[PDB]
């Protein structure tokens, strides 16, 4: 819990870099526990690249690059979004043993509880920077949003 | 059951191309199943492309594009191997309703049972060809495996 105020730091900077671009603003990274040290930043690519997979927490797994499997076991990963099934997927494969969750007011899946049962750690610190750019996004590109998460 | 036959041999085309290109074996493609059009075939793009989330699920997937939510609600989604806790939760996350699997064997996540127990119709289809062709990755390379399933 150390650097959960640095991640969520990081990850919302992602966030709000994604929002200028024009894309939905979710953004995440990928801290080793031990160091605090980043291995990798992202956010939702969807607009940027015109791409179905790279959610901010996919984009960010991509951008820490291929990893030996025990490197993912003593990491956290943040995002600035509870995530949908598919990160959920994502930090469960790798076994990423912590997730923290910016919000969980603008969405939530199944997958925050899906996590904790798989025997991860979820945290969800409820920052309001995270609720308020995701809240003005849902606002004013619905379609977008919904696109986003499949609906 | 009508496109199934296609499905598989367009996802196993696709396992075969990324062999040839040096990576994991792995294919997809997902089809309309009102008229078995192919929105999009993919495979693993971890060796081509340095790729810690481009499983050929994932792959197939950024490879239809983006898509309104509707579209992939009559889908079906085939993949040369069972999968992995991260592809599961795309299919689940856009809500694809059909996965049909060309083997098992040489892996199976959780997330088969998973799908079935999210509403999902999972379909296993026992190919050889896609059997032998995996069962030859794992023998040969076991260290790149482990890797891309997080081990
Ligand atoms: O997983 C979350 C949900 C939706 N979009 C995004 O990028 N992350
Ligand atoms: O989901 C499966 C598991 C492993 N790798 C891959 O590409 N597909
Ligand atoms: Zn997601
Ligand atoms: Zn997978």
């Known amino acids: 819990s150390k650097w959960d105020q640095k991640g969520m730091d990081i ?4 966030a709000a870099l994604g929002y200028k671009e024009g894309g939905v603003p979710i953004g995440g990274c990928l801290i080793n526990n031990k160091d605090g040290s980043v291995l990798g930043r992202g956010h939702n690519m969807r607009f940027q690249k ?10 960010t797994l ?3 690059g291929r990893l030996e499997g025990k490197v993912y076991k003593d990491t956290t990963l943040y995002t600035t979004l509870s995530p949908c099934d598919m990160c959920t997927g994502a930090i469960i494969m790798y076994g990423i043993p912590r ?3 910016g919000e969980n007011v ?3 899946s ?5 996590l904790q049962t798989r025997g991860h750690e979820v945290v969800v610190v409820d920052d309001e920077r995270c609720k308020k750019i995701m809240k003005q996004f849902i606002d004013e ?6 696109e986003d998460i499949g609906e």
Chains 1, 2 share one sequence.
């Open 11 to 14: 990850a919302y900077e992602e």
């Open 50 to 59: 015109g791409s179905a997979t790279l959610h901010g927490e996919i984009s």
């Open 62 to 64: 991509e951008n820490c």
């Open 99 to 101: 997730c923290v969750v």
């Open 106 to 108: 603008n969405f939530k």
């Open 110 to 114: 199944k997958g925050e509880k899906y």
């Open 141 to 146: 590109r619905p379609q977008d949003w919904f």
